[PDB]
Amino acid sequence: SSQIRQNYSTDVEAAVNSLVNLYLQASYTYLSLGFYFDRDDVALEGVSHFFRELAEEKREGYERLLKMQNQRGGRALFQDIKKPAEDEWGKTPDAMKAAMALEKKLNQALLDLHALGSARTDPHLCDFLETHFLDEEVKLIKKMGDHLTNLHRLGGPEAGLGEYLFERLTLK
Amino acid sequence: SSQIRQNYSTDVEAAVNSLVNLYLQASYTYLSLGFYFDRDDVALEGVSHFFRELAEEKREGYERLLKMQNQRGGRALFQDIKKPAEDEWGKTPDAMKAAMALEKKLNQALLDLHALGSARTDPHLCDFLETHFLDEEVKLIKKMGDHLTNLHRLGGPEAGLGEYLFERLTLK
Amino acid sequence: SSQIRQNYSTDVEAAVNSLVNLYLQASYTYLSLGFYFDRDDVALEGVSHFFRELAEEKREGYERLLKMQNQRGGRALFQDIKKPAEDEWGKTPDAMKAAMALEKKLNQALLDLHALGSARTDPHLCDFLETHFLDEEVKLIKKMGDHLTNLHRLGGPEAGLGEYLFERLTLK
Amino acid sequence: SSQIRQNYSTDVEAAVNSLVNLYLQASYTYLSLGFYFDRDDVALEGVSHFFRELAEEKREGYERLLKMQNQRGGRALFQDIKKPAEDEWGKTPDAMKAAMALEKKLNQALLDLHALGSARTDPHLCDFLETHFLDEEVKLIKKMGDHLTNLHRLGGPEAGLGEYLFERLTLK
């Protein structure tokens, strides 16, 4: 057992380890996306660089979750980071839909974890998620929402020109 | 009666005065440990300086609590700050156990107060404790938990050398 | 297939993706180690920080590998990241042996990949691994070897005392 | 013959002189493209500037080759630099396909020369090409591959407009 187990339940601990696996699948998916958009047959350095940053944000994510779990004295435990859903992410809007769907899944897992944390009454977990996960997701999901709307706006028979202008002018 | 006071229930107000008294007992206890580890027959200036910092932190604790009590229009009511649980804190590990147990008890009182804040529906109390209490306690109980683990790693037939190397190389 | 892909054979590409998966298992293992050594019953900030930097450096490893595979016109693809071997890593020498074994396994995969690149006549792959992998692992396996020797010079009948000194003084 | 000559085979000298002539054809080709894209009826100062830089990097190439050949006691037997394959290079993608075909042929000559370096046991030649030719051509062939994919993703009824946007937003 652990001497720092002040009010941190075994099912919240199991949920936080499940959340860490989710944030790891997210970092690994944004790694796959980040390098996919740098393949020569895709060649969108800015779309790449955006998902390179999201892999890093999700990496600060699982590092904060593990840091927090050790702060609560929980057992960190690890199971397979199952592979990113596609090895062929397709056009920028397709990949941005996949990124959006991944982040909405991830935010759902955080909202579910806060629902659990408030149900068990674990105020430090509520604070932690509130402080730098729930707002991290909401800002980032809004940013991907703006990107999706701009990619739908730029959609048409000239969609290739759309993706280039999206990348150069929005994604630096 | 207060003219500014809103939502802030009488049981929360009394529990905040109770938390102030607990944070004062804690501060006074860390004053006792802080000067105990500076006694000539104990002589662990780093262990002293650590508990001196905790007395300062638990002082910022009751000061933040009382500033908040006033901001909510609560009467700050001052009860006796009872004598610390010992004045012979003994070996560094046994003193650190007493600190750990005090700090866990203080965190438990904050969680009881947050649970009361939730049960009275007071968001600003919940925010205030989440902002700069529950974070402090979990970081500090973790820091004591690490100190205890290192002291239990160092404890043995050479325990006095263990206490010294802990005080020198962990506690500056 | 790719417009840029020159000389980069199918078995080089398969081996490089296998190396990316190996480096991902390595980062994930140094993550588990890094957070295990931060765990309250383990409490070794410098050992945690050492494996945190190895998770970081193995992350530069797979990111450099993927960057290179893209620069060679490979189709980077992703298997599951298999979990770290066992998460109760034992005492620091037991964990440092698990790290050494993992690192020698990883360096073996680099040497196998360079031998494969030499057997397929891929000079650029030979250069890339020479440039900032083979040196990178040899320096690091030397550093792990130094740490193992120190943890076997220490860590006899004084056991835990030697482990603490090793963390404080060797690992900052 | 030469008092410093060691392991530098007459085959390696003949191949290095052939590579120097080929890097001179490459710089001379990128001179023709560089000034063709500066031409009033073409007017793409970014595409011009891009090929002006490639002519410069291919010059740093043949100079560094000659500097090395003197470093190894070979004789710099120069040959006629044939005119580039066109001067009416056409649209930017169709010119840059020729830039790719040139650079991949230049990279093939490096790989042939490195294969000869291994087949004559010249570790210093192998290192020299590995150090600052092979990885340049790989990074450069990647960069052209990215530019071609962007240009094909900008080729269609939006041609010309996509060619200008490519210049304006990539080559600036």
From Swiss-Prot, chains A, B, C, D:
Gene3D superfamilies: 1.20.1260.10
Pfam families per the UniProt record, alphabetical: Ferritin
GO molecular function, one term: ferric iron binding
Domain Ferritin-like diiron stretches: 6-155
One GO term (biological process): intracellular iron ion homeostasis
Keywords recorded for this protein, A-Z: Acetylation, Cataract, Cytoplasm, Cytoplasmic vesicle, Disease variant, Iron, Iron storage, Lysosome, Metal-binding, Neurodegeneration
PROSITE patterns membership: FERRITIN_1, FERRITIN_2, FERRITIN_LIKE
Modified residues (N-acetylserine): 1
Residues annotated for Fe cation binding in this entry: 53, 56-57, 60, 63
Role noted for this protein: Stores iron in a soluble, non-toxic, readily available form. Important for iron homeostasis. Iron is taken up in the ferrous form and deposited as ferric hydroxides after oxidation. Also plays a role in delivery of iron to cells. Mediates iron uptake in capsule cells of the developing kidney. Delivery to lysosomes by the cargo receptor NCOA4 for autophagic degradation and release or iron.
Name under which the protein is recorded: Ferritin light chain
Organism: Homo sapiens (Human)
